[PDB]
Design a protein around this ligand. Sequence first.
Ligand SMILES: [Mg+2]
Ligand SMILES: [Mg+2]
Lengths: 311, 311
Amino acid sequence: MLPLPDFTATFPEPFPAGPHSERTEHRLLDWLEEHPLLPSAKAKAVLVNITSHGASRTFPTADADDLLLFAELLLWLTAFDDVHAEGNGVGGPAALVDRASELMLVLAGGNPPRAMSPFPAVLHDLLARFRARASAAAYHRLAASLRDTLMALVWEAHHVAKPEGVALATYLAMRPHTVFIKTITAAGEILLGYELTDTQRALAAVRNLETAVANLAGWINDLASYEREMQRGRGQPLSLPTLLHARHGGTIEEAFTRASSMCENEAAVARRGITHLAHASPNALTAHARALEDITRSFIWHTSHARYQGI
Amino acid sequence: MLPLPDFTATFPEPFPAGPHSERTEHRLLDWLEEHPLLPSAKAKAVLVNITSHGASRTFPTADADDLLLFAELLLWLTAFDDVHAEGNGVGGPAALVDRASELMLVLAGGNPPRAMSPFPAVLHDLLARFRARASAAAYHRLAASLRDTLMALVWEAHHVAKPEGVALATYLAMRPHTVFIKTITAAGEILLGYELTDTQRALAAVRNLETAVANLAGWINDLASYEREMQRGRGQPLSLPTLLHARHGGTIEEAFTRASSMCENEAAVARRGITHLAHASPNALTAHARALEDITRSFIWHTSHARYQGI
Ligand SMILES: [Mg+2]
Ligand SMILES: [Mg+2]
């Protein structure tokens, strides 16, 4: 009974999915057999399913092998967040810092000490396969996005106990890093075989679209996962409706109406940006517009998945 | 009366300094007038002095303007550490995480909210001037080194209260990131106008030298600053002698003998690496060997400075 955003004018259903969803879903389960990252087998089944099926919507052009690589990086990242960063209440922020520092050493290169967690070694392998596939600058972009996300997960872990201690503007700036949108995009430039010049990245039209997509991804995730987060023992989660409710007073229903309004407007900005940037002739600016459209559609798709709700 | 390493066989005095030490020292004080980063004026005078004079030893080839840019980045970084990361005992690790997250947003690009600390805005400007001067890949390297250092400063802040909770091997891997050696080297490749291919960076000879220099820089800093760190209220610092003392038992004098022995051996490895890599003909591998030699000499020089001791 919480009002939700309506994207029928901006991103209507259905969202095209590529062919290799079931193959990816099986190859992911075999991969996770040599490399267990998730305690429960049910947890593994839900996360493998939304990852493979969501990845088919994210990069429908696909290429079963490239899709599996991205699906492996995204599941590794989501599992790391779900295990350590979100966690449950053991070791606190400091344990996540230790786990994030091990990953930073992997990203820096150069034979760090072996870790007891499996996450560093899987990351080492995934970065290796991406380095082979990408341009030097493109791999640097992927590695930077992961470094930035690790700092933002550390930041979040220090504020979940008192969400009301966070200013709304700080949350809006940090949330694109905890929703993984920059890793997904940087992985897309590699796997779709394109790349922007640094002058293109500075274009107002490119920046404004990337911001709107980042905002939309974080905010719909926030709305989609709120009710589930309440059902835990802890209080209100660190997310958009919680901060709007704190800012404006009133009720959670009104916070959701405001948040749903913010999402619809962001979706309209994003649609306009996709349309502007797809008329451009520099060609790299197209494809990028289309990649961001598919990324956005996938994010809207996966809010109906059981990871966020029930039945 | 604590035994110290002897580098006369490997890095004999004196260490060549370039011309622009006093000019840099004045331009730094004028820069810090428009951008106060340091509370005390005496603190400012000591840190400006070791930075300008040390930078003359680090890049003797210099070029007064390029030297001032590097000197500004190094002083900004050292001041950030000294203010927040080291701090004194207010806000804890969580305040440093908030300050580091603001800097991560600067490094990610894209108009974050304005901060009340001056450190983010100065970083924004310094990265701008380095982006203009560097190749795309080279700037990415500089930005990655800073991201990695910010995570390692966060890690350190979570362990200084219980240094004995850190395993020696973890400390040795993390310390190159809190001593800033990778930022200094990456800044050197830009300012000295050279750059390695990723295959060159993978050469065993290149890697082994970079590791020995990173180790030596962190360890001599540890030894040079130990007695000063004790003179604070807190206990033993998170640094090499503290962990050797914990590992082996015995006395602090014996810890320093062991640490001094580790430094002399690392210096011998580094000398051998400099000599091997300077015979090579790929030319980028020279100059890099010479840049690392100068970086190493500067680190040995600044242990005699008043920042570390008295008179
Ligand atoms: Mg999260
Ligand atoms: Mg420090």
